[PDB]
Paper text:
AusE (Mr 35,100 protein, 314 amino acids) and PrhA (Mr 35,121 protein, 314 amino acids) are very similar (~78% amino acid sequence identity) αKG oxygenases that both accept preaustinoid A1 (5) as a substrate to form divergent products through dynamic skeletal rearrangement. Non-heme iron and α-ketoglutarate (αKG; also called 2-oxoglutarate)-dependent dioxygenases are widely distributed in nature, and play a major role in diversifying the molecular scaffold. This superfamily of enzymes employs αKG as a co-substrate and Fe(II) as a cofactor to couple substrate oxidation to concomitant decarboxylation of αKG to form succinate and CO2. AusE first desaturates at C1–C2 to form preaustinoid A2 (6), followed by rearrangement leading to the formation of the spiro-lactone in preaustinoid A3 (7). In contrast, PrhA first desaturates at C5–C6 to form berkeleyone B, followed by rearrangement of the A/B-ring to form the cycloheptadiene moiety in berkeleydione.
Next, crystallization of PrhA required replacement of the C-terminal region (Glu295-Val301) with the corresponding AusE residues (Ile295-Ser296-Ser297-Ala298). This C-terminal region plays an important role in intermonomer interactions and PrhA failed to crystallize without this replacement. EDTA-treated PrhA crystallized well under anaerobic conditions, and we succeeded in solving four X-ray crystal structures of PrhA at 2.1–2.3 Å resolution in the apo-form, in complex with Fe(II) (PrhA-Fe), in complex with Fe(II) and αKG (PrhA-Fe/αKG), and in complex with Fe(II), αKG, and the substrate preaustinoid A1 (5) (PrhA-Fe/αKG/5). The loop and hairpin regions are highly disordered in the absence of substrate.
Residue numbers in the entry:
A (entry chain A): -2 to 63, 65 to 274, 276 to 295
B (entry chain B): -3 to 268, 279 to 296
Write the structure that this text describes.
């Protein structure tokens, strides 16, 4: 708390992973983003960081003369690398309940799947990325405005601490409700230069859940020694294409050891949509693709 | 000229030979939302395709349900690559199809902006009820909310494998419905025009197709015949950002994938930055790049 008269920056609500999902969903609806403390346990986060570390050592640091991949290591093969990720982290019931509240329709099953599973290590000195919305990946989505449905949501987990100085993500709460969704540039955004943000200060295992409609951007890692790690669990709706071809690069040995909802998340199993007709997305001539892969 | 002077002029489908300019076909497609391409598939290849899928079509039982869904007295079959050499080696390698797909979907400097949604043999059986009027892009349920200012979602190259007649269940198209100001469900509750919606049959010979926008209202007609099984081949093509209805890269044998050109590998998801592999083309891991 600050002296009376100080300006108050935007509110980023926070809940323990033990709070009711409806009370966390309620804050997600208000602000577009919410911090879930203890989403991952400190021992699970430590084990995951250690389990992906040898792959992360082999990634070189990309340094360039301009970007968002400037001094940032990126690694997406978490299912292959980390048993704690594939056995425990993706199996968070709180994650899946919130995904259902966002994405799933009645009588249709899982309305969502994985877009990506990226580990990020932001090096000391890495610059701050432009303000943007994640749904800009699906370029038509902004044109539907705040009345549009959700494209994507992110559970952005802290693996090491997120501080203001080591570059914690800067969010714009309530930007999912602005009347018009433009790109954030001088030409297109009238608020440009005048958009107040709030960092997502978190401890390891905390995550923020962020709508694809919310304006955000990574902060500058101003430190001397802090290599800030994050795990982005990016989840899209059933009808959108994933940025990783998990079902073609994850081995069937790991597919056979997954639960049915994890197979669905990675495309080892289909989902049934109802269109006036029950339609399989990602199916096989009227059957679940899981039959053919030997998973039923 | 076309209609007797003074009469109401109904909707009509422009027709082009397959040797016409893709620019001339695409102008028609933009004006009306659909266009016939005569001879999209050659007579010899159409015949070889039908014969190659016939055993797959024979092992498909005929439902007689009266439940109003799209499978009542309608056979549907999506394993054309696996079943037909002519399909995978010849029919999908039409330069005109890709030139048209490139004008609908591709942006400069980003490669192919499209891939396959489905490859479906649709054989309407004698007696089949008419299907509901719909837009194909209702499969991506938010798209209608964007209106005619929205971008293109899906297009289908709907090819006649056997003749399409007014009497055997030819599709009834509503040209220009891609420009109506509000895209709603086509039913009594939601559509003010319901019951006063002008359609046209797509009359076609084996090898003809119509290219149709996902924004166009259409529906199969009733097969009033007693023996005419109206066989069609629907090549559905979507933006690269959208999920296919078939998991073609998990069901098509790698043996067939290695015989595809690069562009057909891309159509089926054997080649990729969507659908990638941790920063690299998935075709590397699959062993398809040399």
């Amino acid at each position: 708390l600050v002296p009376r008269g100080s300006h108050m920056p935007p509110r980023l609500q926070r809940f323990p992973a033990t709070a009711s999902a409806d009370e966390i969903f309620a804050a997600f609806q208000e602000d577009g983003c919410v911090v879930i403390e203890g989403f991952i346990s400190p021992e699970q986060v430590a084990r995951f960081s250690q389990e992906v570390d040898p792959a992360m050592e082999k990634i070189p640091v990309e340094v360039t003369n301009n970007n968002s991949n400037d001094r940032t290591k990126r690694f997406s093969k978490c299912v292959i690398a980390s048993p704690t990720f594939r056995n425990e982290i993706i199996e968070s019931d709180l994650m899946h309940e919130l995904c259902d509240r966002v994405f799933s329709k009645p009588g249709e099953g899982m309305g969502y799947h994985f877009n990506d599973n990226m580990v990020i290590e932001v090096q000391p000195g890495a610059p701050a990325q432009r303000l943007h919305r994640d749904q800009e990946l699906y370029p038509w989505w902004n044109s539907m405005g705040p009345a549009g449905p959700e494209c994507v949501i992110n559970f952005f987990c802290a693996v090491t601490p997120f501080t203001e100085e080591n570059g914690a993500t800067r969010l714009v709460p309530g930007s999912h409700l602005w009347p018009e969704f433009t790109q954030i540039n001088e030409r297109d955004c009238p608020q440009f230069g005048k958009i107040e943000t709030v960092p997502a200060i978190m401890q390891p295992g905390d995550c923020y859940l962020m709508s694809g409609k919310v304006i955000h951007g990574a902060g500058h890692n101003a430190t001397t020694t802090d290599r800030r790690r994050a795990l982005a669990l990016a989840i899209i709706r059933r009808e959108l294409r994933p940025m990783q071809a998990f079902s073609l690069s994850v081995p069937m040995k790991l597919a056979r050891e997954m639960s049915e909802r994890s197979q669905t998340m990675f495309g080892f199993r289909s989902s049934v949509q109802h269109c006036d007709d029950m339609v399989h997305f990602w199916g096989n001539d009227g059957k679940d693709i899981a039959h053919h892969l030997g998973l039923i």
